[PDB]
Amino acid sequence: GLPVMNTPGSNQYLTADNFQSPCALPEFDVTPPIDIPGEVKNMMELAEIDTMIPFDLSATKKNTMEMYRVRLSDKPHTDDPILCLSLSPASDPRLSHTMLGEILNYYTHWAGSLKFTFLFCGSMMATGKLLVSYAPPGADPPKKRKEAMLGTHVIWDIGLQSSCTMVVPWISNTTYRQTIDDSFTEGGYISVFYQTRIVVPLSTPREMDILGFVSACNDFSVRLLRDTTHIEQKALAQ
């Protein structure tokens, strides 16, 4: 009998443990793998896929194919916002249910650069210039082009190219941010504006739609695996 002494932890069951255990089906000859297309190796691979943003979660158009369409028009120039959004990838209503947002909710901490892409779905004869902006936290959220202008921004020429990408670079005080709305780890403000205005000729539609997309850049990562609130069994009993 080799003399042993039991330590604390003995006989416990930690659901996150990693030990060997006896096989119930000994000598079982497994079916070989085949080269199935589309293998995934990391959840972050998925987070890097651009999925479409539910921007207009307005009362009447949420939970409908409309929530995805941001409407624009040939209207006169204004310095007022086309859309205002907060950089809370996991907790903001508009971002939270995107593929990125969903994966972010199985984790507690995130870090990295985000990538926003806008697609102009209006007509070929339509022209215009828009201003896309990102404002790092700590000041009044931008309500006017004049202030959005002052932060990180891009000027998009609709007429020249149909789509436009803007990278929101990782800038944070903390090493990582939390996957919940929390002032301490806030990320800032994304907003879009009319630089000039949408201009169309006669015999052509004066209103059109833009679609928007988000995904993670390759510098991105997450930590502390956790259960999500985005699904449940309330009726369950465990």
Partner: peptide, 15 residues
Amino acid sequence: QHRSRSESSIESFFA
């Protein structure tokens, strides 16, 4: 690739 007859060996059968 290739199927094994191991789980039907006399030992495996009575194991």
